[PDB]
Every structure is written in C-alpha cells, then in structure tokens.
C-alpha cells in the first residue's frame, strides 16, 4: 500500500508519510504573472541537448519516465538562475483526464492539459541520490502542454506507450531527441521548490517556461490509455497524476522577461 493520486492515497494524504509535504518550499505553485518580478540579472537559459542519450522508457506506476545516460556531461542545463552545471537524467509528464486540467504549476490559476518535467541534477554532487539531499541539487525545466496542433517531436514517445501500459513495464527507447519537445522561446519564471511526488524533497530550482507547446488531442488521448496498475491487476487509467498548487509562503517568483 502507498501513495498515489486516488481518493484515499492522493496528495492530501501524502503529509502523513511525508511530513515535508507541508513544508516551506513545496511545489508546484500558482505563478501570478503580475506579482512575478522581472530580474534583469537573470541570464539566458542554456539548454544543451545535442549529445543527449536516451536509453529507456519506464511506467513507474505514477507516470512514465524517459531515461537518459547521465554518466557523462552530454545533455546539460546551465545559466538562467543556475550556478554550475545540471545533467539531464529523465523527463516525464503530468496530465489530466480532461484537457482542462493536468498541469501542476498554474499561471494566474489557469491549468494546462499537461506539464512536461525535464529533471536535471547538479554535477557538483556526483549523483542524483546525493543531489536530492541538497537545496540546490536539482533543476527541473517545466513546460506546459496545451491541446491543438500535434507536436511532431512527441510522437515517438506516444507510439511506444502501448508497450509500457502497466506499472513496472519498460522498453528500449534510444536516440530520442528532447529538443523536439521545446517551445520556441526560453523565457521563464523561476523559484525555489521541491519534487512534486514523494519524497517531496526541497531540492529543486524550478524553471518554468512561459511558452507552452501544443500537442494534439490524439497524442494526449494516448497518455490517458496508460495504467497506474500493474499487469493482471484491475485497470485504473493513469490520468490526473498531478499535485495541485501549494502555498507560496516566503518565496518570490522571478521572471527572465519584461
Ligand atoms: Zn514531475
């Protein structure tokens, strides 16, 4: 038995096992665009994915992760509000049962159909496990998804989902280029936060892009065919695997644009 996104084990229950759920820098949050302050000291983000090496795609019971080889400096995130170099380890999404919900972060209370999270860890800490124990251990690039035109670069991901329908299933997923999932503009909002799933560690520098990417209804429909359950257990569609906005508390959201 364990945490999930159901009535009995969902986000409002997480604090019992993970008391930090009620902490001082929890994610996600609502981004109030009018209250976010432009910070002209913020540098342009540096997204260097040319040598990215995807390996595998996994249904872990809460979402699906596209994993990358992070044993060398190959896909890295630098600049922006970041000091140092962060290595891409995996990306995953959060989505809803309906196009009107699914994103974790919200913009002026607006919920997008889904949200992509490209997770990177700070190379100064040697590995992901050690990085999550540090306040500046991770950098997660969040990108909103809206339903409209299809995202060509996402199709390869969607077509493999049938092979990892249930919890615990994985499939080879090599040569996937995450650059095909990035919007045109890299304008962003940034604030100190946490993982949005248990253990909910407060180790993340969040970088959320202003510009959403568009995906087709057919593409998101396929996300909704995945299962939270394992093979041979009652089908529970993997939908609404998003944590709602948490109190901003003593934090300021900064914008890289005016
Ligand atoms: Zn996430």
Give structural notes.
The chain has 258 residues and is mostly beta strands. It has a single domain (1-258), classed as Alpha carbonic anhydrase (Carbonic Anhydrase II, Roll). It is 8% helix and 29% strand. The chain has helices at 14-17, 128-131, 155-160, 217-223; strands at residues 30-31, 37-38, 45-48, 54-59, 64-68, 76-79, 86-95, 106-107, 114-122, 138-147, 170-172, 188-193, 204-209, 213-215, 254-255. It is globular. It binds zinc ion. Zinc ion is lined by residues 92, 94, 117, 196. It is an enzyme of class 4 (lyase). Interacts with SLC4A4. Interaction with SLC4A7 regulates SLC4A7 transporter activity. Interacts with SLC26A6 isoform 4 (via C-terminus cytoplasmic domain).
Topology:
Blueprint: H1 14-17, E1 30-31, E2 37-38, E3 45-48, E4 54-59, E5 64-68, E6 76-79, E7 86-95, E8 106-107, E9 114-122, H2 128-131, E10 138-147, H3 155-160, E11 170-172, E12 188-193, E13 204-209, E14 213-215, H4 217-223, E15 254-255
Parallel strand pairs: 1-8, 2-15, 10-13, 10-14
Antiparallel strand pairs: 3-6, 4-5, 4-11, 5-7, 6-7, 7-9, 9-10, 12-13, 12-15
The structure holds zinc ion.
Zinc ion binds next to strand 7.
């Amino acid at each position: 038995h364990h945490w999930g996104y159901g009535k009995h084990n969902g986000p409002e229950h997480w604090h019992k096992d993970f008391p930090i759920a009620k902490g001082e820098r929890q994610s996600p949050v609502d981004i109030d665009t009018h209250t976010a302050k432009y910070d002209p000291s913020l540098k342009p983000l540096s997204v260097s994915y040319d040598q990215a090496t995807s390996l595998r795609i996994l249904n872990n019971g809460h979402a699906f992760n596209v994993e990358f080889d992070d044993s060398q400096d190959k896909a890295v995130l630098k600049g922006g509000p970041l000091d140092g170099t962060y290595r891409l380890i995996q990306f995953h999404f959060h989505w809803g049962s309906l196009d009107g919900q699914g994103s974790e972060h919200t913009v002026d209370k607006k919920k997008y159909a889904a949200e992509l999270h490209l997770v990177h860890w700070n190379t100064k800490y040697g590995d992901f496990g050690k990085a999550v124990q540090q306040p500046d251990g991770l950098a997660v690039l969040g990108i909103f998804l809206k339903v409209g035109s299809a995202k060509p670069g996402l199709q390869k991901v969607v077509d493999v989902l049938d092979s990892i329908k249930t919890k615990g299933k994985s499939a080879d997923f090599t040569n996937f280029d995450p650059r095909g999932l990035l919007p045109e503009s890299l304008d962003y909002w940034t604030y100190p936060g946490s993982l949005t799933t248990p253990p909910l560690l407060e180790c993340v520098t969040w970088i959320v892009l202003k510009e959403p990417i568009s995906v087709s209804s057919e593409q998101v429909l396929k996300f909704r065919k995945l299962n939270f359950n394992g093979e041979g257990e009652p089908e529970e569609l993997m939908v609404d695997n998003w944590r709602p906005a948490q109190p901003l508390k003593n934090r300021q959201i900064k914008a890289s644009f005016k």
